[PDB]
Write a protein that binds this ligand. Structure first.
Ligand code: NAD
Ligand code: NAD
Ligand code: XI6
Ligand code: XI6
Lengths: 427, 427
């Protein structure tokens, strides 16, 4: 009874894909092997708000195998994989999540993780986008006092933590998992380099070769999106407000342009800025017939979807829609502006989510155990753990690490076992 | 009389290439436009130890145009462009540098910059690899007291600064220019992606397509080298001691291997580690006939060249040599293990050196003006100047920056004019 999923009968399928996914997520299995006996999360009560995919299943069960009790919701109304949710619910784990939630239901699902039977309350939060963090701070401040800290998955959620802390609003420790090197430089980038393409294809089956595709933003996500579409023969355009990131794109042979200038020339538009209304009404009115528009950043407000309620909306299939302009021209909007990789496909593949999620588990162990050593600010995990995360993934893909001799360790000033780079190294 | 170059009659050619190079180095010209009247380096006496190329010419004359007086040497015995040296000497600027120096001459050239006519002594150092910094600290400690600080170009020199500072040996402020974003992420990477290939070609004219090429190290330099050879159809192998960098290479589809395992299989070997004897005698003995071996890191000690004095060395052309093993098999060694892009070609092209060198000038202005605000540690320039450097290069390559609206600036928590990223952002 203590769950809510679309069809519990999907659990056997979800379980079958969880089984394959474990073979793809060596970081998470290595942590079970290391820690399942010593149960370092015994006593941990984790409220989780993070896209309920097959990958998040392997995360949840890793937390459980280390002793934690969890209550889970998704951080996006379209990102859940129903068969994953079911497999977790069937295990007796409270999960509240399904593909196709309304906004009211979304927030109800979050609230469900803050209160469990028998006076269950979380002492930890695991968040992706900052919504759970906001609910707790703004609507359940008595709970705040028993929270040891939050671990946060993504760039947008980290921005929101920093905004809170600047104004004295941050009332618990927070671990920024996004800016683990083995998160930002791998999930954000190599994740989207595969899953952006996947969502576009499942949704529209559009040919990438020969198309003019515009990526807004050239951060870690935009960089992966650009490479993804360039590999398939698209002319790729980039927009940026940061001169350094703009220069990076130019030096990779992308023309750096504004959407103000090029709106009539693009076949495909991908927002990847984590910002607000970078695609406006006049941009879309200017777009050619059947232009495809999608967002991959965390929130749908990258696009002014409100500006389109004016027109008629004709559904094509779930999460793929036409909006018809007065002159009859149509644009294709994916997942109503919600992140297209998780909305129209399945998000990143399991291997790279293992890197991201191995950082999450380690962040949760660190907060549960040593939260008192931390103040109400944003922290990152030390580099030796970052390096550990990468080590655990090398075996799966056949990479053989070279070992430093003593004299080589001294020559560059490191311990043979790491950390191998200064704190400010950018990889 | 106050210079020493190979043939002063090369000055007109050097000048003709300096003229083209200015059109390629908008960062340096923008700084002259901004600063040549106010002469913010008037009174600056700069001792420079940095590869005397056409690019360094435009740097030197930028320093002069801002009021500085300089005395210049190269930081490598093979890296000088003689026609560049001449053009500078003809302008009456003391430069001591030529292609093909002996070690004794090299150190004599450095010393020449520490003492000028009429009791000229530097109050600033500009260094690339740390040699000038070492000479001054270890052999001219009375000079040390009048030095306001050093600006350092490259990863190896920065390692050496950090080693000094750890043991209380650093006795002046130092600006780490390598780890400007517009240095490390552009020169180290996109520079070598062009100039590694250039040196290999000029030296050996070898076909890259179909060859097995091994890059040792996958930092900023190794990353550019890998992409360079992959673009031309080489199977590219990578060796690394850092698990994070190893994982990056695997996720780009490079096999990560040890040279211990693969020495018999490689056609081309590039050392890019900044480390010591990563290529040993037994590796080269194991190498196939006509295997090509080169180093692109700062010092030739990446390769145990000493281990080859045993055998006969047959010259092919300047800086390209055969060493014959007892069984008659031959390996090709480029520039006796010195950095191959500058040793067998011309180093990076002017456009990217403008980014590197615009940081240098700004570092020199900051030390001359505000050195007293600094302690005897290593600093980087603030991000707003990093961003300025990129801004100055956007126009040349046609990149158009998007401007944030007020609400977009607020939404992500930045000023509209920057800095646009937190200090720890890795680009
Ligand atoms: N869908 C996924 O699987 C996934 C994965 C990781 C992150 N994300 C989300 O993607 C978004 C981007 O993340 P990131 O790590 O790349 O962020 P980032 O800060 O590294 O990069 C974003 C870039 O957007 C640029 N930008 C900002 N405003 C702009 C504007 N108005 N026009 C053009 N460019 C602009 C910035 O200069 C910056 O370089 C965030 O919302 C993040 O949470 C999604
Ligand atoms: N020739 C040029 O134009 C040019 C340009 C920039 C820098 N450099 C020189 O290149 C070298 C590398 O610079 P960088 O910025 O790439 O440094 P970096 O620290 O960014 O990368 C070097 C890499 O070498 C790896 N490494 C260290 N020891 C190793 C070993 N024994 N086996 C395998 N891998 C090993 C490290 O893990 C690291 O990732 C330095 O000497 C630097 O000064 C030359
Ligand atoms: N398959 C998958 N399962 C679970 C979570 C996933 C995912 N694919 C991307 N994600 C996150 C969402 C993004 C933005 O919210 C990133 O931060 C990334 O860490
Ligand atoms: N054409 C050129 N002129 C002048 C200097 C150049 C160069 N090409 C690479 N360099 C440097 C040497 C390397 C290592 O010493 C890097 O740090 C780079 O900044």
């Amino acid at each position: 009874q203590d769950y809510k999923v679309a069809e519990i009968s999907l659990a056997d399928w979800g379980r079958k894909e969880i089984a394959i996914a474990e073979t793809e997520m060596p970081g998470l299995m290595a942590l079970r092997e290391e820690f399942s006996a010593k149960k370092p999360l015994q006593g941990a009560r984790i409220a989780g708000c993070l896209h309920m995919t097959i990958q998040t299943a392997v995360l949840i069960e890793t937390l459980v195998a280390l002793g934690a009790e969890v209550r889970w919701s998704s951080c996006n109304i379209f990102s859940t994989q129903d068969h994953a949710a079911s497999a977790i619910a069937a295990k007796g784990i409270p999960v509240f999540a399904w593909k196709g939630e309304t906004e009211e239901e979304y927030w109800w699902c979050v609230e469900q993780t803050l209160s469990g039977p028998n006076g269950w309350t979380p002492n930890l939060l695991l968040d992706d986008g900052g919504d759970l963090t906001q609910v707790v701070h703004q609507k359940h401040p008595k709970l705040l006092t028993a929270i040891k800290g939050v671990s946060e998955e993504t760039t947008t959620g980290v921005a929101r933590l920093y905004e809170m802390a600047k104004h004295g609003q941050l009332k618990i420790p927070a671990i920024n998992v996004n800016n683990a090197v083995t998160k930002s430089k791998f999930d954000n980038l190599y994740g989207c380099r595969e899953s952006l393409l996947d969502g576009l294809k499942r949704a529209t089956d559009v040919m990438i070769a020969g198309k003019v595709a515009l990526i807004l933003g050239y951060g870690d996500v935009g960089k992966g999106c650009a490479q993804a579409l360039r590999g398939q023969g698209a002319t790729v355009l980039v927009a940026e407000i940061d001169p350094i990131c703009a220069l990076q794109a130019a030096m990779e042979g992308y023309r750096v342009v504004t959407l103000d200038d090029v709106a009539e020339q693009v076949d495909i538009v991908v927002t990847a800025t984590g910002n607000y209304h970078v695609v406006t009404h006049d941009h879309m009115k200017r777009m050619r017939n059947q232009a495809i528009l999608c967002n991959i950043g965390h929130f749908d407000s990258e696009i002014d979807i409100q500006s389109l309620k004016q027109y008629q909306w004709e559904n094509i299939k779930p999460q793929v829609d036409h909006v018809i302009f007065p002159d009859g021209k149509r644009i294709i909007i994916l997942a109503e502006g919600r992140l297209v990789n998780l909305g129209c496909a399945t998000g990143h593949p399991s291997f790279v989510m293992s890197a991201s999620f191995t950082n999450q588990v380690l962040a949760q162990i660190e907060l549960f155990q040593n939260s008192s050593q931390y103040q109400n600010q944003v922290y990152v995990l030390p580099k030796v753990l970052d390096e550990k995360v990468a080590r655990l993934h090398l075996g799966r893909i056949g990479a053989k690490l070279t070992q430093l001799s003593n004299e080589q360790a001294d020559y560059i000033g490191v311990d043979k076992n790491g950390p191998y780079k200064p704190d400010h190294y950018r990889y």
